[PDB]
Amino acid sequence: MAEYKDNLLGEANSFLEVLEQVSHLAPLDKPVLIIGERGTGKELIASRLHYLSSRWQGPFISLNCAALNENLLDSELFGHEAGAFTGAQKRHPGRFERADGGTLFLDELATAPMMVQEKLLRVIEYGELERVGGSQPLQVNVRLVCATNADLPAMVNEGTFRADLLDRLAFDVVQLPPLRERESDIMLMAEYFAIQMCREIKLPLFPGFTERARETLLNYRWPGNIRELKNVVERSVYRHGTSDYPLDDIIIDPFKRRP
Amino acid sequence: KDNLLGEANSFLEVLEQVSHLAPLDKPVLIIGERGTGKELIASRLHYLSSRWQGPFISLNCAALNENLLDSELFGHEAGAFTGAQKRHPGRFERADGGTLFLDELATAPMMVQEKLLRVIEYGELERVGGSQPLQVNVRLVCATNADLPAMVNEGTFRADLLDRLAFDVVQLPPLRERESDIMLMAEYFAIQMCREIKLPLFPGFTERARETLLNYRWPGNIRELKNVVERSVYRHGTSDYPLDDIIIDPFKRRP
Amino acid sequence: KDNLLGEANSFLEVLEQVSHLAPLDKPVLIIGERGTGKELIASRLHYLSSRWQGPFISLNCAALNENLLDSELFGHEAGAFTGAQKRHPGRFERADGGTLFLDELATAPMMVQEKLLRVIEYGELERVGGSQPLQVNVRLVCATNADLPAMVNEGTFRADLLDRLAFDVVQLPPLRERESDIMLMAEYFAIQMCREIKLPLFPGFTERARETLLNYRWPGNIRELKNVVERSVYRHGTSDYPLDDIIIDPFKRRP
Amino acid sequence: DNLLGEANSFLEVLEQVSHLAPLDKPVLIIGERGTGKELIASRLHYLSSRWQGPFISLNCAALNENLLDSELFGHEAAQKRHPGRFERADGGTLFLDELATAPMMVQEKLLRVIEYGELERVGGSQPLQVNVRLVCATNADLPAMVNEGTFRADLLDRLAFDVVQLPPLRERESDIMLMAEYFAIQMCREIKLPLFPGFTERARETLLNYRWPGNIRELKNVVERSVYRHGTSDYPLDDIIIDPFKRR
Amino acid sequence: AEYKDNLLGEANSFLEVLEQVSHLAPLDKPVLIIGERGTGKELIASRLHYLSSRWQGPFISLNCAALNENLLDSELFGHEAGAFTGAQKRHPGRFERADGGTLFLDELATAPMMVQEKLLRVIEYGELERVGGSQPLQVNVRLVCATNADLPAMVNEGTFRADLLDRLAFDVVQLPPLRERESDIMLMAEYFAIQMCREIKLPLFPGFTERARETLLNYRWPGNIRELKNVVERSVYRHGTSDYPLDDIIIDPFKRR
Amino acid sequence: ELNADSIPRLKINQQYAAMGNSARNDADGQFIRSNLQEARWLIKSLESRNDTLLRVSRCIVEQQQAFFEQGEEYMKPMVLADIAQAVEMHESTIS
Amino acid sequence: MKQGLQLRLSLAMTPQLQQAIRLLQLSTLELQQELQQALESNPLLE
Ligand SMILES: Nc1ncnc2c1ncn2[C@@H]1O[C@H](COP(=O)(O)OP(=O)(O)O)[C@@H](O)[C@H]1O
Ligand SMILES: Nc1ncnc2c1ncn2[C@@H]1O[C@H](COP(=O)(O)OP(=O)(O)O)[C@@H](O)[C@H]1O
Ligand SMILES: Nc1ncnc2c1ncn2[C@@H]1O[C@H](COP(=O)(O)OP(=O)(O)O)[C@@H](O)[C@H]1O
Ligand SMILES: Nc1ncnc2c1ncn2[C@@H]1O[C@H](COP(=O)(O)OP(=O)(O)O)[C@@H](O)[C@H]1O
Ligand SMILES: Nc1ncnc2c1ncn2[C@@H]1O[C@H](COP(=O)(O)OP(=O)(O)O)[C@@H](O)[C@H]1O
Ligand SMILES: [Mg+2]
Ligand SMILES: [Mg+2]
Ligand SMILES: [Mg+2]
Ligand SMILES: [Mg+2]
């Protein structure tokens, strides 16, 4: 029962209601699936969910989804009891076995191996698993956390994602307000990022943002929800001088052509 | 026994067929019906069978690794690698007469199918460089969510795999097809969820809305359709709330 | 001694050819459809061969992968090899003087075929750290369901090796092609199942069942007959009430 | 010593092979599914001064590359001094077979053995150079296949000074009937048959209408199949076993 | 430490790049170097690391492109303890080098998509690449990138994720083309000639013919330093004993006669 | 280098080995053989311990040359694992 | 890397002898006392 709000920024839009729904769903230990904004914000959502989870509930096990071509991933998921599977020849617990009662922060990497997803379907079937060469199965308990970045029904119709994979998962869907849609805390989040950047660079004083910069930010597409904006703020701070005439000069990103 | 039942006439006929096939240890290929075939029903059938007294155990066909499939059939082999030196028997040998329920049958590899069906149809427990293989008559049953004849026409599965089935392929009716105990099943699921949601009882309910929700596609699984009731209960989070004007569409974005 | 389910004029000619086959360990090949069971007939002939009491190898070829002959076939009796310290037996070596039946040799690796080429050409090739190998006195046997005539044309196996692997290759006519004595086989299977299912007696098949069996495609041939027997065991009904007809279809809807 | 059908071109080739037999130069042979010169290679070893010398003929297809150098005089960590590939063949004929489908690591090892390289394994730091007469066969791959990049060009350069050409059985089959009769007699002795009932000349001519893809192997297989089909020696056979893989 | 700028580019573009590097040196963020074949990008990155506030502990410039497999690069990023068996080197050492240091890579376009995703996941968290049965260690490490291929081109190709490209690209260092630079090229050539005359211990420096210098300038010389050093060595091999100004270029081994 | 005087040294009793090898009594010969095996194991263990100590000292000096030459001020912060990394032995052997 | 088993060739529980040997190297002057004690028992070591 701790706050651990951390850098929870950009909630002036309906993201406040999303956070309220997340808080409502936090007590339940059922499957947790989300839809993060493409390019930014999924990590923040995962951190918010972990904060919603009790600090003493268990370790926050996070894995980036990967194909089954790496047998190490299979050993991490199913386990490794026999030799030549993982670690020593003994029962080296897998990543799923590493998480006992903790959050399983899944990643929607859309990995090519549907076999990996099929294996993970058994990972959450009744709360049990068997290691590689495991003489006896082991019933395990752990929390599950998931997110998304594309249209799941489109992949289901197209067959890119297994129908059973979607059916077993996604007890409820959590949608992230898009950066082109949130557009509410742009000033507030930008100010927070600017303050953090000024503190990091030991800037003597806040430089301030021109109204033209705000208009450009409003016109900006902002593909990344909370990271691209922060990166743009950092790039502008790099090209600007705090409490000086260079503060007007703002750089969107080094990727853009130099002025 | 412990598992809840559909309690339908078609469900009753399926249970009667399962009871008739219970003493038989021959292979079965009851259709998985794409999530509609309760694996708990197969577990209860194994319980009715003498394999319950024996070592009944199941596994997922697609869980094994490509390079360890021979090991998966025969456990850890003594001479396979330098580290492990012990003739550990296979999972089937770990059963050796129990009820082996094959899941993910349609997802098995072609080489895996060729090895497994050939071994199961005839052959004894031979490890890597074994002296003499040991014959272990283990009761078998398989599940297939898709149409095996469709795979045969596509040729993905072997004809020997088709013949691997020894019992009739028991098929469960679809949720849209069955739709018989939907009210009673929904009530039981709601009671279970309320116990899980720490709710004593729901003061509000509407049987008409429950029937309307039953009149749905119910894709994925019948249990998946029941999970919609739990999702709606969690979203409402209230007891004095009738089932009327309530629809569970987690995928759909609310306005 | 050797129980036979096939009693036909073509089957009689095949049995005579088996009698015309002696224990010369020649590269004969029994060819038959899925579920032909010609491997059992080959084992019976091997028992009737010169080695009346001799070894026999099932040797499901699909289980071999990334393993040389000296892994399971020839064996590794030498110590300090890859792995722990021990001496391993060899299936092909242990089978010397007995029978070496190849189970579904059509499904084999290209390198496996390359090794088997010399293994059959010489008979003394493989050795786990040995200079000169010893010729094996075993009898070479094989049986599958594929048609090598096209596989060789497709390059799936070495034409020279396959020709060397072929000496007195014999093709078993399909049971569907035979289309005879099906009623006798059905009655025998009914008796065997009534013994197995502890049934009082065979219910009996009317003219409708006989016509259905005659009109049955029976693509599995003897395998189809076994599947029909299993279905009739499932479709036993009442012994007093003769079964007017008995049919089986994996995808047939219940209604 | 070696029994085979005799042809004028084959006789000249055998004479040349016997002349080269006393020479211990490396040999690269190409076969045509017939005798394959393996019997010719053994006869050459017998005719050479290495008649009593080692005649190790390694069919290089079943080995594992993880112990490939182990095969070619390689030993490491309890028992040592294991006879190497060249060591076991030292002082005599060193024949290589199954060379068509060998791994590229085997090609590199052969290129090293072309200059005889050295075998500095933990079991022994031998300089190799066993000086035994090398010989290679089972060259199923065509010269174009070598030109197709399948094999190392240096190994082809490292090959023998000449190439042993083999003609098809269809090219010369005058003595094929005599060889078939001898094989029939040998099988009748093996099958404990009373005597040869004979062969129909018309049926023999009909059987002669074939390309003999397996050459002597095809002839032997056809003779065995026909003898097994006859199953008796009362009257001469008047039929041809066209193919065991033929519907009937 | 102190940045080393021996034979620094006389072109004002090089001076501006050095000024930007000095400005970014106190900062701690990833950097992208838009370089060319032998343009001198990695040496510039090393000089920046020398100027990057402290000496920044270990400095490793391992390139994923010049690796046998992407799995080897992943093991260098992080080695799971007990995974597989044996190794050509202590793989965790590469990860430990970044600890108390920065990350430098060359030809990052060749990195596998899975490897790129693992690196992107590591960078945001800072933890060790391979868990090895234990929680990965968040080592305080900076980063630097140097790829001739365009980042927007990679984004169009889609090999690198949008988050990977965005968070990875914090600073851009566009190396001026070697052919484009002329005054800096001449200054660097003179410095290299002096350094070679010293190192080769030749009693007298031959210098450079005007025709030879004009021919050298006429050469495209994409390798601002690599090709420059190769041509210097080619001329040194044709040692004229300080009397032959021909400066024959034997750098191309294929070229003969 | 290890101090030559300080390092203990053991020598196998040649007269005793000769007597045991030609011992008429089988039991006496077996006892002599067991004693010889034990003594050989002890001698090998002592020699290996001395060699391991010498190698560990050399490795430690390789990294502590700065403190050895400049003085205590130029002492590199070193841990047991640091020394264990340069050698093939474990930190337990280092301790 | 690639999954597999033993395909080419390549540890120990030290007993009381080697265990006491490991227990040795604790000191040098004290080690001499133990060595003299052992040499007293062992009749084939000088
Ligand atoms: N309020 C906030 N607090 C903390 N981080 C934020 C906030 N808003 C945006 N972010 C940033 O947005 C980024 C979202 O990245 P992520 O969702 O992991 O990318 P992707 O969706 O491509 O996987 C995070 O790295 C985070 O730093
Ligand atoms: N009668 C029932 N009562 C309660 N739960 C059931 C019932 N039937 C099925 N289930 C649920 O269905 C899930 C299994 O789905 P299942 O129908 O076995 O899928 P599949 O057809 O793919 O095997 C189990 O978790 C179980 O809780
Ligand atoms: N001679 C026979 N008489 C009766 N049934 C037979 C006979 N041969 C085979 N079968 C049937 O065939 C089945 C096994 O065939 P199988 O061995 O798979 O054929 P194949 O040799 O093509 O692999 C058995 O269930 C058996 O009932
Ligand atoms: N001149 C001959 N005399 C006796 N037998 C022969 C003769 N030529 C060929 N053969 C037979 O033909 C077979 C061909 O075997 P092999 O040399 O392995 O063929 P390939 O060269 O295709 O590998 C041999 O087993 C041999 O018995
Ligand atoms: N400003 C400079 N002063 C002196 N030498 C330089 C300078 N820039 C680059 N070099 C030289 O160029 C050589 C190659 O540098 P670089 O191309 O960055 O390495 P890499 O081949 O790893 O990209 C280095 O050895 C360095 O000595
Ligand atoms: Mg299922
Ligand atoms: Mg079969
Ligand atoms: Mg051959
Ligand atoms: Mg470089």
Ligand SMILES: [Mg+2]
């Ligand atoms: Mg991400």
